[PDB]
PDB file of C-alpha atoms in Angstrom:
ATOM      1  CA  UNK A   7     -43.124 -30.232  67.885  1.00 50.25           C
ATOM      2  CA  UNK A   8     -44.786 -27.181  69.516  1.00 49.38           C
ATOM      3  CA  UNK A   9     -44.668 -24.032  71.512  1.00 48.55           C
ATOM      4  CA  UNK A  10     -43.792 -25.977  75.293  1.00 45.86           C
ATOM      5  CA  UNK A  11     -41.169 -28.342  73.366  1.00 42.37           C
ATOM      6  CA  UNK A  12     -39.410 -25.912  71.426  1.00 43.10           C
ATOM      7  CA  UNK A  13     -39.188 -23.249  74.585  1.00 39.06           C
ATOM      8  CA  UNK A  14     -37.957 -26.537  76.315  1.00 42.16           C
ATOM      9  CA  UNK A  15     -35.117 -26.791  74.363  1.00 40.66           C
ATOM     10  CA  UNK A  16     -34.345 -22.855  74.296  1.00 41.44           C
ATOM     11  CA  UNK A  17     -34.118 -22.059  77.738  1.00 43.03           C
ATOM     12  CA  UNK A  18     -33.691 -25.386  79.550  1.00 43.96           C
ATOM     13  CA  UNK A  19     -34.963 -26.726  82.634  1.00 42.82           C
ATOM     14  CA  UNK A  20     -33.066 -26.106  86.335  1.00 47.24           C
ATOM     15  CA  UNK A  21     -34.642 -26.421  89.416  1.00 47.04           C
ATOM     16  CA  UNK A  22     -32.357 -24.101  91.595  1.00 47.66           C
ATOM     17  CA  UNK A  23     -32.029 -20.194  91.267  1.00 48.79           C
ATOM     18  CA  UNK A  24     -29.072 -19.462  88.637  1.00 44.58           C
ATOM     19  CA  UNK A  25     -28.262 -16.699  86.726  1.00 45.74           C
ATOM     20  CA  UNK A  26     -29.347 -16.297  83.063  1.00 47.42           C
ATOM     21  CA  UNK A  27     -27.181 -15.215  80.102  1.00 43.48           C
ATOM     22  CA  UNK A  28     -27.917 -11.604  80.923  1.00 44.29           C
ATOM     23  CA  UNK A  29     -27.011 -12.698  84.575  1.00 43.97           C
ATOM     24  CA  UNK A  30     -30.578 -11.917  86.123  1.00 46.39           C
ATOM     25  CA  UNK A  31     -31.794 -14.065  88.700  1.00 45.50           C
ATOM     26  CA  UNK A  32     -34.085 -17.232  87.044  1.00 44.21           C
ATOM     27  CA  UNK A  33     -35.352 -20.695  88.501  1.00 39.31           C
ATOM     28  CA  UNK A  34     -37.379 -23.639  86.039  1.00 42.70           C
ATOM     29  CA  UNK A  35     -38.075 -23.326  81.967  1.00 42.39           C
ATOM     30  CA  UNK A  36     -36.886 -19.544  81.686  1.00 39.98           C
ATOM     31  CA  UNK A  37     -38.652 -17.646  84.308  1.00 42.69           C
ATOM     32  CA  UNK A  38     -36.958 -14.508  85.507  1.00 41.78           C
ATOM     33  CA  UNK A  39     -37.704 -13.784  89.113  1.00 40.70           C
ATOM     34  CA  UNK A  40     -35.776  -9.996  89.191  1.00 41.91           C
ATOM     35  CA  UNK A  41     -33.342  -8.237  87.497  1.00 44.30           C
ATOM     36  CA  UNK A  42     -31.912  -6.901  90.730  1.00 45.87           C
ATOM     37  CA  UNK A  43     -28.661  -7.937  92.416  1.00 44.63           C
ATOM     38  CA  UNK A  44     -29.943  -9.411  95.163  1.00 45.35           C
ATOM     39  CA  UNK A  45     -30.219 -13.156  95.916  1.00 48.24           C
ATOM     40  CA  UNK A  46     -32.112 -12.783  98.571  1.00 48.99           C
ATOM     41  CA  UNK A  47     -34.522 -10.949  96.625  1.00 50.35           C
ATOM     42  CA  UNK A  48     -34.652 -13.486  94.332  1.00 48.72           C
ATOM     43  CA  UNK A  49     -35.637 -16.116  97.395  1.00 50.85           C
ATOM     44  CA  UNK A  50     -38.235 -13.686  98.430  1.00 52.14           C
ATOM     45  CA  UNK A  51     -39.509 -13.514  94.583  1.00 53.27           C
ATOM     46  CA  UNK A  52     -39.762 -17.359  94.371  1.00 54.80           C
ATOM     47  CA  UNK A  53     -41.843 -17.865  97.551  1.00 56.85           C
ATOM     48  CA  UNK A  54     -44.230 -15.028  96.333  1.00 57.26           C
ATOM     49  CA  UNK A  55     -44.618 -16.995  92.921  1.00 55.99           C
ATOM     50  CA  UNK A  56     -44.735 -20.243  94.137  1.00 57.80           C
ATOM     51  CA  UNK A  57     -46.844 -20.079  97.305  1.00 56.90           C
ATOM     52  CA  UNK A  58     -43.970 -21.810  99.955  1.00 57.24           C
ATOM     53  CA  UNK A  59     -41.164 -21.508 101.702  1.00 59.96           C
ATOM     54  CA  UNK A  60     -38.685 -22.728  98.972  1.00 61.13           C
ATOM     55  CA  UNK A  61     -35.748 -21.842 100.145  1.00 60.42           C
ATOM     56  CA  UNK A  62     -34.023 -21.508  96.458  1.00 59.04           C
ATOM     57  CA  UNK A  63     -35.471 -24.820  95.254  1.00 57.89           C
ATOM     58  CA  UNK A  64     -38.382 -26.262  93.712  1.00 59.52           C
ATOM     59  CA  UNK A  65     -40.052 -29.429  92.254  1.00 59.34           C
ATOM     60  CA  UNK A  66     -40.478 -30.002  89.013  1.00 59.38           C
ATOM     61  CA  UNK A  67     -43.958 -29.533  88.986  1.00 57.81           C
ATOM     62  CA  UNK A  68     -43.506 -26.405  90.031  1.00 57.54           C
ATOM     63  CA  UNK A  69     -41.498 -25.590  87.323  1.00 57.18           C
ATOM     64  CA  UNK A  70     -43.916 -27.022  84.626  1.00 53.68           C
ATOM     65  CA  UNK A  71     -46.604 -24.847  86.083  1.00 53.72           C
ATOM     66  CA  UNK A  72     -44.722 -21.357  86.158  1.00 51.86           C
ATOM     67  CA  UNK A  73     -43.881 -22.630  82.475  1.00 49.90           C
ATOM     68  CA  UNK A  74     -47.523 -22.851  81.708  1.00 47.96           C
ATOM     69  CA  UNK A  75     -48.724 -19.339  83.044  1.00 51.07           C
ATOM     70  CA  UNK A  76     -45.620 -17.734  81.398  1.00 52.26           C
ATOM     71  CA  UNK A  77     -46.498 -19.055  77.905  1.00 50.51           C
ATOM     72  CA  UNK A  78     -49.933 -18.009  78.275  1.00 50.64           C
ATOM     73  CA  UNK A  79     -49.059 -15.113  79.344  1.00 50.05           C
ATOM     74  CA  UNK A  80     -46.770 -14.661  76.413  1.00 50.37           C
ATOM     75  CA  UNK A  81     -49.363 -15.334  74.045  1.00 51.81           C
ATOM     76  CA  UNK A  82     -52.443 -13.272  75.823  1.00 48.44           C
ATOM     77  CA  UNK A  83     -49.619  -9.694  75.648  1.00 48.26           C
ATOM     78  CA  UNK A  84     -49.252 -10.824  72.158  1.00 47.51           C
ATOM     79  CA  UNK A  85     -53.367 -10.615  71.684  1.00 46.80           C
ATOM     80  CA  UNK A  86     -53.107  -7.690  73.802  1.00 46.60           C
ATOM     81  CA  UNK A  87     -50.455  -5.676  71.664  1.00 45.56           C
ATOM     82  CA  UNK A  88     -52.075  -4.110  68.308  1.00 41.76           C
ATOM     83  CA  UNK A  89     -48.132  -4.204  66.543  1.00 42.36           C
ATOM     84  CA  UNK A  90     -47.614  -7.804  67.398  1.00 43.58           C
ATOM     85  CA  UNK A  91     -51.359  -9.196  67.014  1.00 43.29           C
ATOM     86  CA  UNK A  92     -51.243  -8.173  63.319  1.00 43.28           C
ATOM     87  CA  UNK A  93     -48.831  -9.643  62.943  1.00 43.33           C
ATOM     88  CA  UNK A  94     -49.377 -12.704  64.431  1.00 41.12           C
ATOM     89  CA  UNK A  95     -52.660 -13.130  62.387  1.00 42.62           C
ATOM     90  CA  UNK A  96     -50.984 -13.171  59.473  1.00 41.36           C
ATOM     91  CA  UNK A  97     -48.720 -15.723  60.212  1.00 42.15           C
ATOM     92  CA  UNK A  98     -49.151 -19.562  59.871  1.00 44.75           C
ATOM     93  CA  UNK A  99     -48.661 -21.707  62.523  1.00 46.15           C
ATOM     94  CA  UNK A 100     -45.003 -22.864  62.984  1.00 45.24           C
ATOM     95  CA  UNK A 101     -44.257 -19.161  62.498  1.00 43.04           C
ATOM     96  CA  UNK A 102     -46.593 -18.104  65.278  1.00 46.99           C
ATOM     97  CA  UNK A 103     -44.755 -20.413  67.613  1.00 45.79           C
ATOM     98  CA  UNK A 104     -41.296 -18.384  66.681  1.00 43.91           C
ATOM     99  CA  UNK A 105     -43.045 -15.169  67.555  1.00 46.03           C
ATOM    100  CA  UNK A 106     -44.081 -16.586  70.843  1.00 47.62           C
ATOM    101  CA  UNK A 107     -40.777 -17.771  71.292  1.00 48.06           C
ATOM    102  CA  UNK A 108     -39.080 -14.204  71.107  1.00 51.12           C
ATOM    103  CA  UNK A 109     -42.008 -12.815  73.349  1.00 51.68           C
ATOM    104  CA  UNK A 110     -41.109 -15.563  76.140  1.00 50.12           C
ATOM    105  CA  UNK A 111     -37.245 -14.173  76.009  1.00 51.07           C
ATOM    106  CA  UNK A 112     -37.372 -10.887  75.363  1.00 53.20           C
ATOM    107  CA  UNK A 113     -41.095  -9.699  76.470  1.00 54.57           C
ATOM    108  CA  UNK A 114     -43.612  -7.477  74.424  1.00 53.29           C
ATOM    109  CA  UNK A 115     -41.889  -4.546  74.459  1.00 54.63           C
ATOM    110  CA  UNK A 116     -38.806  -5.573  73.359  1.00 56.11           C
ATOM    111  CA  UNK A 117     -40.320  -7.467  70.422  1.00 57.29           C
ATOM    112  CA  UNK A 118     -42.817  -4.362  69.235  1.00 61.72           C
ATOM    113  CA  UNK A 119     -39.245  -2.528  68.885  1.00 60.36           C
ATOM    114  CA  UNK A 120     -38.470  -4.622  65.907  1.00 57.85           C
ATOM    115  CA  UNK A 121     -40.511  -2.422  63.393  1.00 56.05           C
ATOM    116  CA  UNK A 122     -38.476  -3.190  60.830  1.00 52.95           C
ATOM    117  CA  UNK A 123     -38.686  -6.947  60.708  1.00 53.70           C
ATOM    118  CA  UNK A 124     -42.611  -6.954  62.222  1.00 53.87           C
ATOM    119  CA  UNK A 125     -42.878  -5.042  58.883  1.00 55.26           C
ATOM    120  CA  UNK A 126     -41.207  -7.870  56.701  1.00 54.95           C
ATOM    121  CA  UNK A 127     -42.879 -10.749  58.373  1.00 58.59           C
ATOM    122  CA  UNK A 128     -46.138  -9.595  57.930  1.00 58.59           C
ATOM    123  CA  UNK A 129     -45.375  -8.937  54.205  1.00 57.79           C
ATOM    124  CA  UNK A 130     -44.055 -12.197  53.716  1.00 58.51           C
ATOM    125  CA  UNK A 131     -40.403 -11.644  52.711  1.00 58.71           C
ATOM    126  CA  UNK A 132     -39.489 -14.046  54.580  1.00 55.89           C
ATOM    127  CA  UNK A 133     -35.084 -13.879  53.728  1.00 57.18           C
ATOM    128  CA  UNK A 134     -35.350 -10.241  53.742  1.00 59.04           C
ATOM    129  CA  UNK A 135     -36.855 -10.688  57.431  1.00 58.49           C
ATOM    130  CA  UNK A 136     -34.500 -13.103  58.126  1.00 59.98           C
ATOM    131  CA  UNK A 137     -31.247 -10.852  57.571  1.00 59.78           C
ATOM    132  CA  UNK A 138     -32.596  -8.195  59.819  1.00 62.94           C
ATOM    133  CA  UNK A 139     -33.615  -9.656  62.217  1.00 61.04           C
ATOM    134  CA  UNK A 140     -29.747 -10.769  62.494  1.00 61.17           C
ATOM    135  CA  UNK A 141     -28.929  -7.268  62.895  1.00 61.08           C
ATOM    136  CA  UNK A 142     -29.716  -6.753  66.468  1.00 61.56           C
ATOM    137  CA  UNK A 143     -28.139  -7.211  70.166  1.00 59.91           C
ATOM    138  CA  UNK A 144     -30.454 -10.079  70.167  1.00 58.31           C
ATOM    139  CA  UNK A 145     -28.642 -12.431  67.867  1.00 61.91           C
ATOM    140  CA  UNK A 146     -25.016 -10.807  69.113  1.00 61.58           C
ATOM    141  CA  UNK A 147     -25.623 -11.942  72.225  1.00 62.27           C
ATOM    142  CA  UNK A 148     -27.280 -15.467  72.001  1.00 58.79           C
ATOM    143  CA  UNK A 149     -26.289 -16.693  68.432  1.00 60.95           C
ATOM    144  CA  UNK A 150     -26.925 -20.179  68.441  1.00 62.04           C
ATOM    145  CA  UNK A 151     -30.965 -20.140  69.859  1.00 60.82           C
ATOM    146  CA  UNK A 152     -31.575 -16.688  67.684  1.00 59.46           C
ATOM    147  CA  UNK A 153     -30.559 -18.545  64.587  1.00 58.85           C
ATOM    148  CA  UNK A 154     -32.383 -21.466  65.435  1.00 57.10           C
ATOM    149  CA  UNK A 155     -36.001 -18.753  65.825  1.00 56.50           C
ATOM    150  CA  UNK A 156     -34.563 -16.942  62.640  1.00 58.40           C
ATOM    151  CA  UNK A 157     -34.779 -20.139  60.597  1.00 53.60           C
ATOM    152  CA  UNK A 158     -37.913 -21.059  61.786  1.00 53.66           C
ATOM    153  CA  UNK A 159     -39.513 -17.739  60.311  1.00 51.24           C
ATOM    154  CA  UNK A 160     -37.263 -18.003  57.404  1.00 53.33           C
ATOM    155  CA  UNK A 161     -38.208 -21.712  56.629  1.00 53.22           C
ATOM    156  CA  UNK A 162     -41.705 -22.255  58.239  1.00 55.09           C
ATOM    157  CA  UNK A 163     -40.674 -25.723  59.368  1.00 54.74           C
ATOM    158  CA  UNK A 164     -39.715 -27.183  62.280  1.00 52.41           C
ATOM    159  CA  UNK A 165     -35.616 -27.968  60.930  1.00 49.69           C
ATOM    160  CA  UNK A 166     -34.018 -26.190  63.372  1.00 48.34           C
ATOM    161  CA  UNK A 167     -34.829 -28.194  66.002  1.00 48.28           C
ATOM    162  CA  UNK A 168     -35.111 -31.726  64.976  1.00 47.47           C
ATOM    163  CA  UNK A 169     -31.905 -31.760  65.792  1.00 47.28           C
ATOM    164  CA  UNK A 170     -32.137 -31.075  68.884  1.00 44.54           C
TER     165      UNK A 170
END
């Protein structure tokens, strides 16, 4: 298992614009193309990321490759962000793939507001990190995939998703 396989199974894979959980305007593995209203916006969006005329719909190539820049992108703003980048040092690699994972959904800045658990993980308490993490709008809102990212950085094994 790794990074592209367990985002995979996260966020899915569609090849139309459709509206996430947060109802914002996405289109392949994840990637948001605005948080505004608009649809059309959204069309306009698409063409500027993908190069063509798309009318609302793409290939699945396409898809793979706005997958591939997003999850580098995802790591290099980790690399780039002094909070996270500790942290991710410290951490072995199954865990790193669970930070990345939270970076994809909920970008940089979202995750560098998690002091308290940044704090945990980095000291290794890994239940204690666990049950705070659980305390957050993150976990209200999508239980089932935040509890399958929580057990990955409470177990440091791929369970959660061999399920899957």
């Amino acid at each position: 298992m790794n990074i592209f396989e367990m985002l995979r199974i996260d966020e899915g894979l569609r090849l139309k614009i459709y509206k996430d959980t947060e109802g914002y305007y996405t289109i392949g593995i994840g990637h948001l193309l605005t948080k505004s209203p608009s649809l059309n916006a959204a069309k306009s969006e698409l063409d500027k990321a993908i190069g063509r005329n798309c009318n609302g719909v793409i290939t699945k190539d396409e898809a793979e490759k706005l997958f591939n820049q997003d999850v580098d992108a995802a790591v290099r703003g980790i690399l780039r962000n002094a909070k996270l980048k500790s942290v991710y040092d410290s951490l072995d690699a199954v865990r790193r793939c669970a930070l990345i994972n939270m970076v994809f959904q909920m970008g940089e800045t979202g995750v560098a507001g998690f002091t308290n658990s940044l704090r945990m993980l980095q000291q290794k308490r890994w239940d204690e990190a666990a049950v705070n993490l659980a305390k957050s709008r993150w976990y209200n809102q999508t239980p089932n995939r935040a509890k399958r990212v929580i057990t990955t950085f409470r177990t440091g094994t791929w369970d959660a998703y061999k399920n899957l």
